[PDB]
Subunit: 509 residues, 3 copies
């Protein structure tokens, strides 16, 4: 074949790429590397959350558990929980027919509590010459009993003196106090249990006072015609609460001393509780990741990636080194192998390819490729580390009659997810174009430094290569790659060669 | 005239620019085309919403309609609605002076409902040896009557036996049950209507229980001194509800089986209900658009563009082809005509203008321009189609005494709008710079490919044009345009011409 | 030193930088100037808010103030407030033991009130033949007294006739109406004060009706064993309210006409009230800035920068004029002085540096720099001026029992702040890359312009400079700078010089 000038090319060195990204302007762009911004894996189980175990309520509802239905696990030894797991259809709810007042708010406050201790508020003896009602509805191991937290005060010897009890919160923390009223199905039952005419109960702190009378009538709860209503109050430190009754009162025995609460979630049973720990629990499973987005489950609690409605989002890190870059004046070469291999993050080289009489080869330019790795590392770290806010669900606990406020809370969570989801999808598409164009600008900048060093000693072939107008052996090549080439040294030889080339004619003149 | 070299210019072809955009860095930039991102057109009427008609409550309030004020249109035949339209001063509210308990919640749940069916819960005969009170306050076809949904139980022959009724929700769906209590103005009226001393009403499900006694005294509603309180509960499947009364109960007759509810809005009357269908209904009119933003009305319901506080936002799609582009080394030509017309999205071509002895002309480069159309299309489709979230108002239904929560919910809607408003205004400005810059970059790329083809056979005039150093007739120009021109074919002629040009002296040596 | 050709260099003229910023891809980039996007300075005091004074409740709680505890300053003369400052341990609350119903809602609506006036609802005479109860718990002006806004109706001559009174809202505005019920500690006290058996109060509008009976028993408030409960209603124009009692009513005397309410905040005492005015009040102090973000305090009210969780964010405006730009083909010079000084926005100039046999000098290119100032100004103004939404806290007032809605509101506030926080941090990083890159493109364009004018009469040195192939005295330099230089003028000279330099040999041939 005809003789050819020695040649040096500046551009990309990499292997063949398989994995593509999308950019705002282009689809299915092959690049040498990328990262996934979205977490899709999870444990598929309920785990501890940041070292703190949840409580699985098993066969019991929250209400049954918190009031102390003796068919439920006692909470005498509980110290903390991160979240609760509850069976919507748990069999053991309130053992004796009744309801809990404001129980959506109570669920929300006990969804997680970081410091919890059950405490005896008032000893059973304080109420005086009374006895304690028990019921087959609320059995303890086959014996008739009652909620662990309350005392059903009833007549002794057919008398019911006025009873009184009080509790001062001296614990230095918040204390949950529970009490109730039993409403008889008949006047006969009321007369029998409580004796006194027009029984009343009066409960007060220095901030509020409530008075309760009996609401007589037949109800349709299972296993009883009468009915109980349960009430609660969270006392701040220094509060005082007093109870007085001539009949009806289900007296407070045990309360809960609680600190750092409302910090959990009531998740639904089904998914299994496993021995494991995660920094982000969702209803599908626990997530352990350094990714800042997840597309698994909107219902999430803890140190979480933001949920987004998205498929995977691949953030380009490497090079667009495909055959067609030549149409933009860029050079690239493909090679299964180099030496010291390819850099991890960008997979991985700006560099040179040469040809002279001694042969061919490729060589990386470490200094420029390092500035690129730094720029890419800086970009990725800024996108990731600046997302340092709070991204678990915006969510509350609500009961059956709180549909409006439940709906609006869930909508605001959805609206916040919509802003994040669009922003994430666009940032990635935009930044992918900017990263690919950044690699191009970098190699073009290297190409211009070479152009500048070669001056009139080389023809710019417009494809990222230079044809050198003198003999350029491996030592010459290495002076070009290492920035020490001096065009003066070869001026005589180069002007003679340029003259010779200028005179060649494809069709004879 | 003096001799001139044949010439080819690479750049923009288009007609005159009638369309200006703003960019992050410049105002009033003329471009050959853009698209509007914000919808400003609407029907000015209330329409069907994605195939589902609303209900115009006409001269009735929601309360009147829902309890069945006989002056209001029966809902016996209604099966569904997308939203409600209500006159805030409708004359027909509760016909007999009264109130509906928790009516904000009730409004919110009935704002729209996908499957609705009225149902007779309990036959009027079940209540026993009672009669039914009617009233001139509630006339039906001129006759004294009562709400369709309730039965005013009163004595028969100066007897009022205890009445009982119950309803088992066996429907597989949610059942709204309504009931009330009448509170006499005097003990005399209470004795006359209900007979029994201290009459009571007891209503209960297995989940809750309420007991109601009469609250006697004169009220100020129009046409009556007495007063009614209406109450409701939404039963889930399997629930059971019982009624018992010795006087005062306004007994349940008709309830409503409902599925997929709380999905609507209660819009205010004034704007007219037209025969039409839209995917997004606002209080101003229906919006039928593929735009993703609207600036018409914040109160919007359905598959909606997100409401933003903004003027129109023009996204540039076409070319910055103005005379001043030459200051940045770019060529452009303005033509009222080109064979085959201009492309739709960019309203302009990348391409060529030429001059030689045969004459002058312009020609589109189809390959480059097509690549641009793909890029702009992909860009637009991303910006638009990635916004597939839920952008109608974050809003609820609240009554007069629910001001705080209403205020808060509205502020959240507004803050969400403030996020999207800024994001939209800025994205457009930013993306317009990118788009106009991308077009430049694309024609600079063409110009460079030609530069590379012509090599030393053309002088780069720095204005987008090359002065060709040989005769280049139409055939030769087509080889340049179609990428087959071979500089070697004209090497002798081009060298001779260059030598001649270098020898010329404007001012004689 | 050897003879050198005359030279002109195109690029940046400025002083040493001393100012750094970060970009998405690089940290600590020295720039000639930047601006701070985040406000960090505040008054450290409570000020008037946009000309409207707050109210410092001093040693009274809001309840105590609004009901008119005589220990609290009278609000007879108040016309408005922008916000309230309250001691959470204020000693003067309700002077007689009691509670205010729905007091969190009340706090929220009175948090700031733009038009307020106290008004006499019902003259004391209306209630008929009763006397006014007073108490040492509520002393005023040396004597037992009672709340300013209420009258404790008690018997006269051991009779308590049924009292009645009404108020019609004909103010055209909303009117806050307060009433109460006294609950005796004993039957003996009830029979003594009110005489009648089973005393009742009936309070009704045309929209609702409430009946209150006495709740007898001993409470634990300081200084009294009985208890009062206080109620309110906000009447819209046209509303009518009626009161009737046979014992217990604390009758309404003064109410409040209000307009544009719910607009404030209840800040906590501590920070002192000062004679100042600002547009944005935070719990840390007043903020008077045109910046659109602040990192001072999340609890902020008014015309506010958005609170973000961020350090300072420095937006690049000036030039990246550092020695290493020459590696990217760019020229810059550093100088202390230039005729007329540096432009303030970018600090300072695109321009020229020359050298010939008359000496060396720099000169600004005013036309290209002004374009850059316009571009940056336009950028800044878009970023700032398009943030014209509402950015103070998403917040409400709640009482102690309203923990869940308070937590959820505060969470929404936080999640909105999290969006703006990430967005502001990224946007500054991204725009800084784009600003410095824009300045680079601008000077490269000026350089290309000069390149085009010099044509073959100059050697492009690839560092921003041109070696001119002829003598170019200062007049010649000036024709280059002002775009009148004509290469034809120096063609003969330049070709002779080029041919000379081509023949020179560093090592003799
Ligand atoms: C709860 O606290 C109160 C104080 O608020 C206690 O009542 C005081 O009891 C002391 C004697 O221990 C008396 O000297 C005071 O006169 C009482 N003060 C008041 C204001 O009533 C009460 O004993 C404490 N209750 C419990 C269960 O410990
Ligand atoms: C509502 O459901 C209850 C419970 O299924 C029905 O009461 C049952 O009625 C049958 C027929 O008389 C008796 O044999 C059962 O013993 C009853 N069960 C209970 C638990 O009482 C009741 O009839 C249903 N009511 C209506 C109106 O459908
Ligand atoms: C409040 O308004 C009511 C309703 O307008 C007034 O009651 C009317 O008083 C007029 C004038 O004396 C009578 O002729 C009407 O018959 C009344 N109508 C009704 C329905 O009551 C009442 O006087 C007003 N109250 C006050 C204190 O101004
Ligand atoms: C550059 O390469 C030449 C040839 O290998 C070598 O002799 C010289 O030391 C190198 N200079 C630098 C700075 O590495
Ligand atoms: C390009 O134009 C030349 C000159 O007219 C023509 O003969 C040739 O076939 C064309 N080639 C292509 C690839 O269109
Ligand atoms: C440019 O420079 C020349 C020489 O200094 C001067 O005479 C002339 O007026 C200038 N031209 C313009 C257009 O400013």
């Amino acid at each position: 074949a005809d003789g050819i000038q020695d040649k040096i090319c500046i551009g990309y060195l990499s292997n063949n790429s398989t994995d593509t990204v999308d950019t705002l302007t282009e689809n299915g762009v092959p690049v040498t590397s990328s990262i996934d911004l979205v977490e899709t894996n999870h444990t598929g189980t309920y785990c501890s959350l940041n070292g703190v175990s949840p409580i699985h309520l098993g066969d019991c509802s929250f209400e049954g558990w918190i009031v102390g239905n003796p068919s439920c696990a006692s909470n005498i030894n509980i110290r903390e929980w991160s979240y609760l797991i509850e069976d919507p259809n748990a069999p053991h709810k309130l053992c004796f027919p009744g309801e809990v007042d404001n129980n959506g708010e109570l669920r929300h406050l006990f969804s997680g509590v970081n410091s919890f201790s059950r405490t005896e508020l008032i000893p059973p003896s304080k109420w005086g010459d009374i006895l304690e009602g028990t019921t087959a509805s609320c059995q303890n191991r086959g014996a008739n009993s009652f909620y662990r937290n309350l005392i059903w005060l009833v007549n002794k010897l057919n008398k019911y003196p006025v009873v009184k009890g009080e509790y001062n919160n001296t614990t230095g923390r918040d204390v949950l106090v529970l009490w109730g009223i039993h409403h008889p199905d008949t006047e006969a039952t009321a007369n029998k249990l409580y004796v006194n005419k027009n029984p009343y109960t009066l409960v007060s702190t220095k901030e509020w006072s409530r008075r309760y009378e009996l609401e007589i009538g037949t109800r349709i709860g299972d296993g009883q015609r009468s009915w109980m209503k349960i009430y609660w109050h969270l006392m701040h430190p220094g509060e005082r609460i007093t109870f007085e009754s001539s009949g009806g009162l289900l007296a407070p025995r045990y309360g809960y001393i609680i600190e750092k609460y409302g910090t959990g979630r009531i998740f639904q049973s089904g998914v299994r509780l496993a021995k494991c720990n995660t920094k982000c629990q969702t209803s599908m499973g626990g997530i352990n990741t350094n990714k800042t987005f997840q597309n698994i489950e909107r219902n999430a609690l803890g140190d979480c990636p933001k949920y987004i409605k998205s498929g995977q989002l691949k953030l380009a890190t490497g090079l667009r080194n495909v055959p067609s870059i030549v149409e933009r004046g860029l050079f690239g070469a493909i090679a299964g192998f180099i030496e010291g291999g390819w850099p991890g993050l960008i997979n991985g080289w700006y560099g040179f390819q040469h040809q002279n009489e001694q042969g061919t080869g490729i060589a990386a330019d470490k200094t420029s490729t390092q500035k690129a790795i730094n720029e890419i590392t800086t970009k990725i770290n800024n996108i990731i580390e600046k997302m340092n806010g709070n991204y678990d669900s915006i969510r509350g606990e609500f009961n059956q009659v709180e549909k409006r406020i439940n709906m609006i809370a869930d909508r605001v969570d959805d609206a916040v997810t919509d802003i994040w989801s669009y922003n994430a999808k666009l940032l990635v598409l935009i930044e992918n174009d900017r990263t690919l164009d950044l690699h191009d600008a970098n190699v073009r900048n290297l190409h211009e430094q070479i152009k500048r060093a070669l001056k009139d000693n080389a023809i710019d072939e417009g494809d990222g290569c230079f044809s050198i107008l003198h003999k350029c052996n491996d030592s010459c090549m290495e002076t070009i790659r290492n920035g020490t080439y001096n065009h003066e040294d070869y001026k005589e030889e180069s002007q003679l060669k340029r003259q010779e080339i200028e005179g060649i004619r494809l069709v004879p003149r």
